């Protein structure tokens, strides 16, 4: 019971906003979101401006 | 489950298949294109007259 | 014999009766939306020699 | 739609005028009968929805959701009557009344023709759920859970109310047919951006979107078994249904307003699946799994393709059945040993073999084994996402792996190994529990034979 | 109507009948295993007929019997491809399963759930038939995941043993990684070729790009346990020996290779993926062979032999010899299943002992097992005019005479020597010398089930190569002209392996002791791949899953930002608003302030 | 058989050779074929004969539904909801029929690839070209509409394409 | 497995355990019986060389460097008995071990079969119920005030007493329970 309580309910009462806690939170929280936004936005911009050029090999691509 | 298995074809897929069969027969019996890139008649469209 | 068993099982008519009443009210609701009955360009038809309405 | 609705209402006085020892029998019988009658909404025209009247209509999107609701009610009654045995007659009737009112609100919400009525019923579902959680919840933590469930939901839904009345002032109607036929593009302006957000955030918090999901572990874990069943099977799907309806007035803005929600949903898919790997509570694990599945549904709705909408419908239905089954399975063991900790009872396959079979089948549908409809939905969504961008496969691929991992982890931890020596009160499985599991599972398997029924309007 | 379709479908249909009878009275009796065995033997003898039809006229067919669902422009149907691969692999798999079920009736006699075990074996066979005969990718995925789950359930048979549960989950994990690539291939093929069936995919892909082929390669690497995803096959030796004999040695393991063979028309149009397939295969065969020669558990040695032969199948797919690769799959099934059954008879006779260091002189004590294992070892090493010879000697000949990566060729030859060496180790250690097992001798191989099953696979391992090779049309332009040294390369390499392994084994009788070489420690601990890759990624993933995802984000920061901030702010504002002292002087003074403000910042503004 | 139209589902004249035995050995395939015939194909045929005898006694038919041609979305004015409704239903039915046309062409392509064996790359070129033409047309009409598609969006797509084509032809005429 | 452990191992116990481990790993290296027998006698001799050392410090350093040698020269894959904690049959039959209390949940129709077994089981249950209180009292008698110090349990000492805490030791399932 002590183990499960410490692993779930006792965690927030013992939290302090610290340089380490804040920096780790920002990193592991919003870093990946912006990484993936950059990746997907870049890929889709490439693909769209490639379609505008008439250059993508879209034959047979009826289903989407 | 039986009732759902024997539900009548209200989604009209058999009808659609027979309709496509009629259309394909008529269209390659006459040498016409199987499908036209225009869904609607271009004679019923009135584009804006000047483009520049 | 049937008096008290009716008095203790009469609740088994409520939901079937509600079902029947709901079917009736659905038909009455249909009876209010007949403004285009046999009037659509796709299904407008000539009545048979004896029929009165194309759907009820 | 009246034929389905009146009998459901009838269920109310039928249970209030029943003898003290016949409430469960009566409610179960007539709930099953109502479910059978509802089964007749699956006949769909094709080109358009069935419009019964000005107020109600049924769709191919709608028909599967209604059948699932009506089918879930008798299962909730079977699951409840065990832990409610000590309760007084009046309080048992009140509990059943809560469940009936919830079913009634849900049926109406799915079939309402216009948004204001949809909003009112979609919000009315909050009261019975809150009462169930806070009055019949086992733990002290239920009160906090109730507050979290209420406030997260209202903070999203009130801007939706403002947006809806504004939209009817500018357009003249909120009827869904008129809304669809007279649709016009949304310009790219700050006003339209905030209208988009106010139209979307309520359904986002209902799903829940990752980061706005904290209410769900609380509420789903602290609720009684029937509360958890209806919260996971049906109430999460209100967000998906509402989003699928509302995104018709939002084009072409969705093209770029969807980016942050897609990022959140994909990364949080990975996040909640990883969280399931280190969970000490067994209900907590099933809740987070639900979150991971609904993230997939959010992606499918945001990318706005026919294949993604089909996959979203199939996944909503399949998740509703599987998640309810998993909650019931966990509750049986909880009833035995009175603790939610996953490592407390081990090696249960040695003591309860048929329940171990139910566990295996539920775990296999949770990881989307072919050709179950869970995999049908997931595969359709993954294909649509691939078309949207080929890099989504990496995230989708990773999620599939982590899901298999935690599903089989739960199975192995609870069923395999050796039994805890000290616990000696694990009695044989009751017929009620086995029948409850079968009535969850048989419908899912049956659905594989006829996939189109749960596919939706796009099909 | 033509018989060919009816018989090919009945072959798979009758296999489901003992599963339907699972809830019946027969299951509760002791007659169920014999019943399942008899059903499988009847299925084999029935599948023999379509094979004759194909071998006579080359008959092939596809059957789209049931329409499942249609999504706008895509139609999904239950369809079966009954080409050369299906009609040749079905009787082989049924024959091996028949032998292994007759063997199981003896090996698993005291198991209290032998009926369930037989049911499980049958379930695997059905899903493998589904995998092999599938005509579209969805049905093939069904068979794929089905054999995956049956593997999971059969590896963790003894579910009270923790290592069995670990090995079962490991198989699932490695397979999932492979599945990722399978799903990638499916998605590409639908959004580009607008179909999932083989016919449309072949028509519309005359120049197949890299992405779908690399997906298929990832899937095959996962399913066939290649060097990235190899460790699950040796650890799957946790299952009962019949499971190892059928599922992990001769049937389920070749699915990845079979997937690459099903798509060879697309792979012959891409040299990059061919190079990748060849290189992956070459490293895998050499590495597995290297790990095998220092193992002391007999099942581990045979499992590493299986991994090495799968690598060889992948290299022969890489040199654009799909038909040749398929032939090896059929040839290797016979003698590798027989090798596993021989190891099982040994293990059962020696009181469930698997370490070869406690197996002494069995060459005389177990004469029939010895004969069978010697013949299987000679077939594995490519002895002339044997089943192994047609399949492996042709593969070495084709790898020698093609425009191929030089490192891959060298690794293939070294692995061909390694094969001879490990085979030598098993025979020398297990059958020669003096007894090293406990003194209560329970050795007894006089059971007709064991003898009959092993004799059946023995006749197979002796004659099937010749018969099959002479009864099929030639799909390969044969290598007729090569230098004599090149021709004898497989033989020269094999004899070298024989001699050197036998020398280094004879030197262990000497009364001299030295500590182990670092190369030995590398070979024995499997290159330290499971020591590192099973601890570092797992630790880091589980640690981040608790510390960052669960605690730092859910329990702390997502709590802090939205709900806790709201509570704190409203609590502060409530305390500020409601804590008035109740003095009218103070309230009235504020009223004056309010009145002044309104008549200035509101009354001056109109 | 005659049940389906052989013009929509064509197949070549089905040339098969005659058996030319070269050995005294008996062919086990033909003996197995006689056995199969007289054990399987005759009882099945008799059962079917009885079933169709019972079918002929009670013969009833169903009729394919025919739909008039109503005005399309181009000749509906902007806020007329009834014309818009009928035009949208007609457009949806046409979309369904076009999906089925593409399905028929794909069935032809698949049947050809299977039938032609090792010679499919040359012997199925007409089927491939036919599919290419149909696929191009279907793609122009419905691709990128998205879910929530409609006749108005299909019309807007067509008009955008027509504008681009007209402007391209006009600047080609100045060349 | 059966004996209560002690707070620590003596130097002598450590030395004997290292002797056994070295012998087993040497047997793993020396497969054949004669060669192992030779090198095991050489091992015993090298072990006896320092048998009668009186300086505890140097004996400890000998043990330490011997352990270092064993670790560098151990077999990476030593032989394990099949049912030992690393064996291939270690926990193979744990899925067949069912606790005896499950027999009380059997249906009366199941207990109709096997009447004699269940009569004798009722006798055993009577015995346990009538011994429990004496067991508890005896354990309270023989135990120091500051709680027990080791995991050792006393035997029975009176006429019809049973050794305290015997039920779950006597009623083990079996080691081949099916
Ligand atoms: C493929 C085989 C075809 C066989 C034909 C006949 C099949 C009829 C079965 C109908 C559905 C099964 C019902 C499920 C609940 C089980 C009820 C139960 O408690 O059993 C008690 C009963 C009494 O035994 P007992 O001695 O008292 O003790 C039982 C103990 O509890 C413990 O005993 P146990 O250890 O033996 O456990 C019971 C068993 C039961 O547990 C199960 O898990 C069975 C359900 C399978 C997995 C479910 C989720 C996976 C998603 C697949 C969805 C497919 C559904 C298709 C439509 C089905 C319609 C209902 O567990 C297993 O055997 C292992 C399951 C692993 C199966 C992996 C296969 C993957 C897919 C295979 C192909 C699927 C598509 C078919 C067509 C493909 C293209 C041709 O035991 C049984 O009868 C065994 C069940 C038979 C096994 C069925 C497995 C395959 C069938 C899948 C669906 C059928 C498709 C039919 C279409 C034609 C082909
Ligand atoms: C023509 C060439 C012929 C020569 C081929 C190899 C000749 C024999 C091998 C060793 C014989 C020997 O004298 O033993 C001493 C010793 C034996 O160990 P031990 O201390 O006696 O074992 C303790 C007990 O006896 C443990 O007792 P146990 O009961 O565990 O028994 C151990 C077991 C297993 O025995 C072992 O424990 C030794 C295992 C290691 C030797 C594996 C040999 C194959 C190596 C393939 C390497 C491929 C490239 C790998 C590159 C890795 C780079 C890091 O014994 C056996 O059952 C038989 C083993 C296999 C013997 C037959 C080998 C035949 C295949 C090799 C010859 C192929 C000829 C045809 C060539 C066709 C192409 C022209 O091992 C060595 O000293 C030789 C190790 C050489 C390793 C070289 C690996 C190649 C790459 C090296 C690096 C290259 C680049 C430079 C580094 C990177 C810089 C950047
Ligand atoms: C434990 C013992 C096990 C061993 C015993 C096993 C016994 C055999 C089991 C295997 C049986 C296999 C049967 C395979 C299916 C054959 C029939 C199948 O084809 O019917 C399907 C149809 O299945 C039904 O559609 C299933 C409908 C779903 C049932 C729902 C039940 C009621 C609802 C319950 C609550 C649901 C909650 C969720 C709602 C969304 C598809 O039919 P279809 O190919 O077209 O038919 C063509 C000809 N028709 C159309 C004229 C008939
Ligand atoms: C934890 C989970 C919470 C739920 C997630 C909610 C997600 C909400 C995020 C909304 C998505 C984007 C919002 C608006 C789209 C673009 C935003 C803006 O940055 O883009 C540029 C806008 O330029 C500048 O960036 C102006 C905006 C900068 C001021 C906003 C402050 C952002 C700081 C982040 C605060 C976090 C907000 C969420 C609170 C929790 C585009 O340049 P421009 O073409 O000129 O403007 C387009 C609009 N026009 C056409 C009318 C002119
Ligand atoms: C491509 C997408 C995926 C790529 C892989 C990303 C990293 C995957 C990390 C997985 C994290 C899972 C954490 C939880 C796992 C459960 C715990 C667990 O399994 O414990 C480890 C368990 C026990 O160890 P044993 O040695 O078997 O024990 C025997 C003695 N008792 O073993 C395992 O299952 C660990 C498996 C981890 C695999 C990670 C390494 C795989 C790397 C593959 C890269 C190469 C790909 C192949 C390329 C092929 C060519 C195209
Ligand atoms: C059983 C014993 C009784 C024997 C008498 C029956 C003799 C044959 C009668 C055949 C049934 C009548 C019939 O042919 O009706 C056709 C009717 C519907 O027509 P279809 O084109 O096949 O599909 C519907 C969509 N168009 O099909 C049938 O119902 C009969 C044949 C069904 C075969 C059995 C189902 C096998 C597959 C089960 C589903 C497996 C999961 C899905 C896998 C997906 C793989 C891509
Ligand atoms: C459980 C947590 C959920 C939180 C959800 C909060 C976000 C909800 C979405 C935004 C809420 C307010 C939107 C307003 C409702 C739409 C009405 C509308 O569209 O009218 C706009 C008006 O737009 C506005 O005025 C909106 C301005 C914002 C005022 C309130 C700010 C509250 C915070 C805004 C950012 C938060 C929204 C996203 C947060 C998501 C949750 C984390 C245009 O009308 P006109 O005035 O006539 O302009 C054209 C004619 N001149």
mmCIF file of C-alpha atoms in Angstrom, chain E residues 54-272:
data_model
loop_
_atom_site.group_PDB
_atom_site.id
_atom_site.type_symbol
_atom_site.label_atom_id
_atom_site.label_comp_id
_atom_site.label_asym_id
_atom_site.label_seq_id
_atom_site.Cartn_x
_atom_site.Cartn_y
_atom_site.Cartn_z
ATOM 1 C CA UNK E 54 0.208 -29.237 -61.232
ATOM 2 C CA UNK E 55 3.137 -31.583 -61.851
ATOM 3 C CA UNK E 56 1.307 -32.952 -64.890
ATOM 4 C CA UNK E 57 -0.093 -29.855 -66.597
ATOM 5 C CA UNK E 58 1.184 -26.930 -64.535
ATOM 6 C CA UNK E 59 -2.309 -26.039 -63.357
ATOM 7 C CA UNK E 60 -2.628 -22.847 -61.327
ATOM 8 C CA UNK E 61 -5.721 -21.032 -60.127
ATOM 9 C CA UNK E 62 -7.036 -18.237 -57.943
ATOM 10 C CA UNK E 63 -10.389 -18.499 -56.173
ATOM 11 C CA UNK E 64 -12.225 -15.359 -55.027
ATOM 12 C CA UNK E 65 -15.142 -17.184 -53.437
ATOM 13 C CA UNK E 66 -16.552 -14.698 -50.903
ATOM 14 C CA UNK E 67 -16.863 -10.926 -51.148
ATOM 15 C CA UNK E 68 -16.177 -9.444 -47.725
ATOM 16 C CA UNK E 69 -16.425 -5.678 -48.083
ATOM 17 C CA UNK E 70 -15.926 -2.959 -50.667
ATOM 18 C CA UNK E 71 -14.561 0.523 -50.013
ATOM 19 C CA UNK E 72 -15.453 2.794 -52.964
ATOM 20 C CA UNK E 73 -12.830 1.716 -55.545
ATOM 21 C CA UNK E 74 -11.294 -1.184 -53.601
ATOM 22 C CA UNK E 75 -12.858 -4.620 -53.305
ATOM 23 C CA UNK E 76 -11.824 -6.981 -50.535
ATOM 24 C CA UNK E 77 -12.557 -10.636 -51.140
ATOM 25 C CA UNK E 78 -11.612 -13.929 -49.549
ATOM 26 C CA UNK E 79 -9.257 -15.109 -52.289
ATOM 27 C CA UNK E 80 -6.849 -18.041 -52.438
ATOM 28 C CA UNK E 81 -3.786 -18.267 -54.665
ATOM 29 C CA UNK E 82 -3.181 -21.873 -55.674
ATOM 30 C CA UNK E 83 0.027 -21.540 -57.682
ATOM 31 C CA UNK E 84 3.141 -23.716 -57.522
ATOM 32 C CA UNK E 85 4.113 -22.373 -54.092
ATOM 33 C CA UNK E 86 0.791 -23.212 -52.436
ATOM 34 C CA UNK E 87 0.322 -26.685 -53.919
ATOM 35 C CA UNK E 88 3.925 -27.594 -53.152
ATOM 36 C CA UNK E 89 4.144 -26.192 -49.625
ATOM 37 C CA UNK E 90 0.798 -27.516 -48.363
ATOM 38 C CA UNK E 91 1.633 -31.256 -48.595
ATOM 39 C CA UNK E 92 5.107 -30.709 -47.122
ATOM 40 C CA UNK E 93 3.715 -28.848 -44.117
ATOM 41 C CA UNK E 94 0.951 -31.412 -43.666
ATOM 42 C CA UNK E 95 3.489 -34.257 -43.814
ATOM 43 C CA UNK E 96 5.752 -32.630 -41.225
ATOM 44 C CA UNK E 97 2.785 -31.822 -38.973
ATOM 45 C CA UNK E 98 1.566 -35.416 -39.218
ATOM 46 C CA UNK E 99 4.970 -36.714 -38.142
ATOM 47 C CA UNK E 100 5.254 -34.198 -35.305
ATOM 48 C CA UNK E 101 1.755 -34.971 -34.016
ATOM 49 C CA UNK E 102 2.479 -38.688 -33.964
ATOM 50 C CA UNK E 103 5.683 -37.792 -32.107
ATOM 51 C CA UNK E 104 3.751 -35.578 -29.675
ATOM 52 C CA UNK E 105 1.384 -38.414 -28.782
ATOM 53 C CA UNK E 106 4.453 -40.040 -27.177
ATOM 54 C CA UNK E 107 6.543 -37.071 -26.038
ATOM 55 C CA UNK E 108 3.635 -35.288 -24.314
ATOM 56 C CA UNK E 109 1.906 -38.366 -22.883
ATOM 57 C CA UNK E 110 2.010 -37.288 -19.223
ATOM 58 C CA UNK E 111 0.967 -33.700 -19.902
ATOM 59 C CA UNK E 112 -2.455 -33.173 -18.284
ATOM 60 C CA UNK E 113 -3.553 -30.812 -21.091
ATOM 61 C CA UNK E 114 -2.459 -32.866 -24.096
ATOM 62 C CA UNK E 115 -5.818 -32.226 -25.775
ATOM 63 C CA UNK E 116 -5.344 -28.472 -25.557
ATOM 64 C CA UNK E 117 -1.817 -28.941 -26.871
ATOM 65 C CA UNK E 118 -3.120 -30.800 -29.914
ATOM 66 C CA UNK E 119 -5.787 -28.145 -30.454
ATOM 67 C CA UNK E 120 -3.099 -25.451 -30.326
ATOM 68 C CA UNK E 121 -0.937 -27.251 -32.877
ATOM 69 C CA UNK E 122 -3.935 -27.510 -35.185
ATOM 70 C CA UNK E 123 -4.724 -23.814 -34.739
ATOM 71 C CA UNK E 124 -1.178 -22.987 -35.825
ATOM 72 C CA UNK E 125 -1.454 -25.235 -38.876
ATOM 73 C CA UNK E 126 -4.693 -23.548 -39.955
ATOM 74 C CA UNK E 127 -3.225 -20.060 -39.619
ATOM 75 C CA UNK E 128 -0.099 -21.111 -41.524
ATOM 76 C CA UNK E 129 -2.217 -22.467 -44.371
ATOM 77 C CA UNK E 130 -4.061 -19.139 -44.398
ATOM 78 C CA UNK E 131 -0.719 -17.314 -44.547
ATOM 79 C CA UNK E 132 0.575 -19.432 -47.407
ATOM 80 C CA UNK E 133 -2.474 -19.535 -49.700
ATOM 81 C CA UNK E 134 -3.503 -15.878 -49.331
ATOM 82 C CA UNK E 135 -4.058 -13.901 -52.528
ATOM 83 C CA UNK E 136 -4.329 -10.396 -51.044
ATOM 84 C CA UNK E 137 -2.326 -8.674 -48.337
ATOM 85 C CA UNK E 138 -5.121 -8.497 -45.756
ATOM 86 C CA UNK E 139 -5.620 -12.271 -45.695
ATOM 87 C CA UNK E 140 -1.858 -12.721 -45.582
ATOM 88 C CA UNK E 141 -1.762 -10.380 -42.589
ATOM 89 C CA UNK E 142 -4.442 -12.490 -40.915
ATOM 90 C CA UNK E 143 -2.300 -15.604 -41.310
ATOM 91 C CA UNK E 144 0.796 -13.626 -40.267
ATOM 92 C CA UNK E 145 -0.620 -12.438 -36.949
ATOM 93 C CA UNK E 146 -2.356 -15.761 -36.368
ATOM 94 C CA UNK E 147 0.857 -17.740 -36.437
ATOM 95 C CA UNK E 148 2.353 -14.983 -34.289
ATOM 96 C CA UNK E 149 -0.251 -15.468 -31.573
ATOM 97 C CA UNK E 150 -0.128 -19.252 -31.747
ATOM 98 C CA UNK E 151 3.640 -18.952 -31.325
ATOM 99 C CA UNK E 152 3.086 -16.768 -28.257
ATOM 100 C CA UNK E 153 0.622 -19.244 -26.740
ATOM 101 C CA UNK E 154 2.801 -22.289 -27.422
ATOM 102 C CA UNK E 155 6.106 -20.823 -26.219
ATOM 103 C CA UNK E 156 4.494 -19.943 -22.903
ATOM 104 C CA UNK E 157 2.947 -23.393 -22.565
ATOM 105 C CA UNK E 158 4.250 -23.908 -19.021
ATOM 106 C CA UNK E 159 2.871 -20.594 -17.850
ATOM 107 C CA UNK E 160 4.107 -20.991 -14.287
ATOM 108 C CA UNK E 161 7.676 -20.612 -15.526
ATOM 109 C CA UNK E 162 8.805 -16.987 -15.723
ATOM 110 C CA UNK E 163 11.366 -17.570 -18.472
ATOM 111 C CA UNK E 164 8.645 -18.981 -20.733
ATOM 112 C CA UNK E 165 6.510 -15.854 -20.324
ATOM 113 C CA UNK E 166 9.580 -13.716 -20.998
ATOM 114 C CA UNK E 167 10.402 -15.633 -24.183
ATOM 115 C CA UNK E 168 6.808 -15.452 -25.415
ATOM 116 C CA UNK E 169 6.634 -11.691 -24.943
ATOM 117 C CA UNK E 170 10.042 -11.390 -26.628
ATOM 118 C CA UNK E 171 8.763 -13.176 -29.719
ATOM 119 C CA UNK E 172 5.785 -10.836 -29.773
ATOM 120 C CA UNK E 173 7.992 -7.743 -29.417
ATOM 121 C CA UNK E 174 10.414 -8.638 -32.212
ATOM 122 C CA UNK E 175 7.523 -9.608 -34.476
ATOM 123 C CA UNK E 176 5.784 -6.282 -33.849
ATOM 124 C CA UNK E 177 8.858 -4.417 -35.074
ATOM 125 C CA UNK E 178 8.658 -6.541 -38.225
ATOM 126 C CA UNK E 179 4.918 -5.878 -38.423
ATOM 127 C CA UNK E 180 5.589 -2.146 -38.630
ATOM 128 C CA UNK E 181 7.158 -2.745 -42.040
ATOM 129 C CA UNK E 182 4.325 -5.039 -43.077
ATOM 130 C CA UNK E 183 1.783 -2.288 -42.367
ATOM 131 C CA UNK E 184 3.951 0.247 -44.196
ATOM 132 C CA UNK E 185 3.892 -1.986 -47.279
ATOM 133 C CA UNK E 186 0.116 -2.348 -47.051
ATOM 134 C CA UNK E 187 -0.415 1.412 -46.829
ATOM 135 C CA UNK E 188 1.919 2.152 -49.741
ATOM 136 C CA UNK E 189 0.294 -0.493 -51.940
ATOM 137 C CA UNK E 190 -3.194 0.899 -51.338
ATOM 138 C CA UNK E 191 -2.461 4.593 -51.868
ATOM 139 C CA UNK E 192 -0.323 3.944 -54.950
ATOM 140 C CA UNK E 193 -1.583 0.777 -56.641
ATOM 141 C CA UNK E 194 -5.142 1.053 -55.269
ATOM 142 C CA UNK E 195 -5.269 -2.668 -54.402
ATOM 143 C CA UNK E 196 -4.155 -5.300 -51.904
ATOM 144 C CA UNK E 197 -4.330 -8.330 -54.208
ATOM 145 C CA UNK E 198 -1.237 -9.744 -55.899
ATOM 146 C CA UNK E 199 -2.622 -9.476 -59.443
ATOM 147 C CA UNK E 200 -3.177 -5.708 -59.458
ATOM 148 C CA UNK E 201 0.074 -5.082 -57.582
ATOM 149 C CA UNK E 202 2.045 -6.914 -60.277
ATOM 150 C CA UNK E 203 0.358 -5.080 -63.156
ATOM 151 C CA UNK E 204 0.686 -1.560 -61.751
ATOM 152 C CA UNK E 205 4.268 -1.873 -60.436
ATOM 153 C CA UNK E 206 6.667 -2.416 -63.320
ATOM 154 C CA UNK E 207 9.307 -0.263 -61.570
ATOM 155 C CA UNK E 208 8.787 -0.738 -57.864
ATOM 156 C CA UNK E 209 10.199 2.072 -55.689
ATOM 157 C CA UNK E 210 12.225 1.497 -52.535
ATOM 158 C CA UNK E 211 9.645 2.115 -49.811
ATOM 159 C CA UNK E 212 7.219 -0.833 -50.250
ATOM 160 C CA UNK E 213 10.089 -3.253 -50.801
ATOM 161 C CA UNK E 214 11.891 -1.992 -47.698
ATOM 162 C CA UNK E 215 8.691 -2.472 -45.729
ATOM 163 C CA UNK E 216 8.455 -6.044 -46.998
ATOM 164 C CA UNK E 217 12.115 -6.571 -46.106
ATOM 165 C CA UNK E 218 11.575 -5.325 -42.549
ATOM 166 C CA UNK E 219 8.621 -7.693 -42.213
ATOM 167 C CA UNK E 220 10.658 -10.641 -43.495
ATOM 168 C CA UNK E 221 13.579 -9.791 -41.214
ATOM 169 C CA UNK E 222 11.258 -9.802 -38.220
ATOM 170 C CA UNK E 223 9.436 -13.004 -39.107
ATOM 171 C CA UNK E 224 12.531 -14.974 -40.164
ATOM 172 C CA UNK E 225 14.761 -13.739 -37.308
ATOM 173 C CA UNK E 226 17.505 -11.948 -39.216
ATOM 174 C CA UNK E 227 20.456 -10.223 -37.646
ATOM 175 C CA UNK E 228 18.609 -7.172 -36.353
ATOM 176 C CA UNK E 229 15.700 -9.147 -34.902
ATOM 177 C CA UNK E 230 17.288 -12.591 -34.495
ATOM 178 C CA UNK E 231 17.419 -13.271 -30.720
ATOM 179 C CA UNK E 232 13.812 -14.426 -30.312
ATOM 180 C CA UNK E 233 14.242 -17.702 -32.202
ATOM 181 C CA UNK E 234 16.836 -19.278 -29.854
ATOM 182 C CA UNK E 235 14.903 -18.074 -26.824
ATOM 183 C CA UNK E 236 11.727 -19.615 -28.255
ATOM 184 C CA UNK E 237 13.276 -22.967 -27.276
ATOM 185 C CA UNK E 238 11.450 -22.469 -24.026
ATOM 186 C CA UNK E 239 8.444 -24.219 -25.534
ATOM 187 C CA UNK E 240 7.923 -27.968 -25.530
ATOM 188 C CA UNK E 241 10.097 -29.804 -28.011
ATOM 189 C CA UNK E 242 7.294 -30.552 -30.536
ATOM 190 C CA UNK E 243 6.519 -26.848 -30.701
ATOM 191 C CA UNK E 244 10.187 -26.213 -31.463
ATOM 192 C CA UNK E 245 10.270 -29.031 -34.006
ATOM 193 C CA UNK E 246 7.328 -27.747 -36.030
ATOM 194 C CA UNK E 247 6.776 -24.040 -35.355
ATOM 195 C CA UNK E 248 10.317 -22.776 -34.833
ATOM 196 C CA UNK E 249 12.425 -25.038 -37.032
ATOM 197 C CA UNK E 250 10.628 -25.925 -40.275
ATOM 198 C CA UNK E 251 7.312 -24.081 -40.800
ATOM 199 C CA UNK E 252 6.490 -20.716 -39.169
ATOM 200 C CA UNK E 253 10.079 -19.394 -39.338
ATOM 201 C CA UNK E 254 10.190 -19.465 -43.163
ATOM 202 C CA UNK E 255 7.219 -17.069 -43.509
ATOM 203 C CA UNK E 256 9.408 -13.992 -44.015
ATOM 204 C CA UNK E 257 11.321 -15.750 -46.761
ATOM 205 C CA UNK E 258 7.979 -16.870 -48.184
ATOM 206 C CA UNK E 259 6.704 -13.291 -48.140
ATOM 207 C CA UNK E 260 9.732 -12.159 -50.126
ATOM 208 C CA UNK E 261 9.169 -15.053 -52.545
ATOM 209 C CA UNK E 262 5.516 -14.083 -53.061
ATOM 210 C CA UNK E 263 6.674 -10.639 -54.235
ATOM 211 C CA UNK E 264 9.696 -11.621 -56.355
ATOM 212 C CA UNK E 265 8.313 -9.978 -59.541
ATOM 213 C CA UNK E 266 8.653 -6.648 -57.759
ATOM 214 C CA UNK E 267 12.010 -7.364 -56.151
ATOM 215 C CA UNK E 268 13.691 -8.321 -59.414
ATOM 216 C CA UNK E 269 13.111 -4.716 -60.567
ATOM 217 C CA UNK E 270 15.109 -3.177 -57.715
ATOM 218 C CA UNK E 271 18.802 -3.794 -57.137
ATOM 219 C CA UNK E 272 19.117 -1.775 -53.928
#
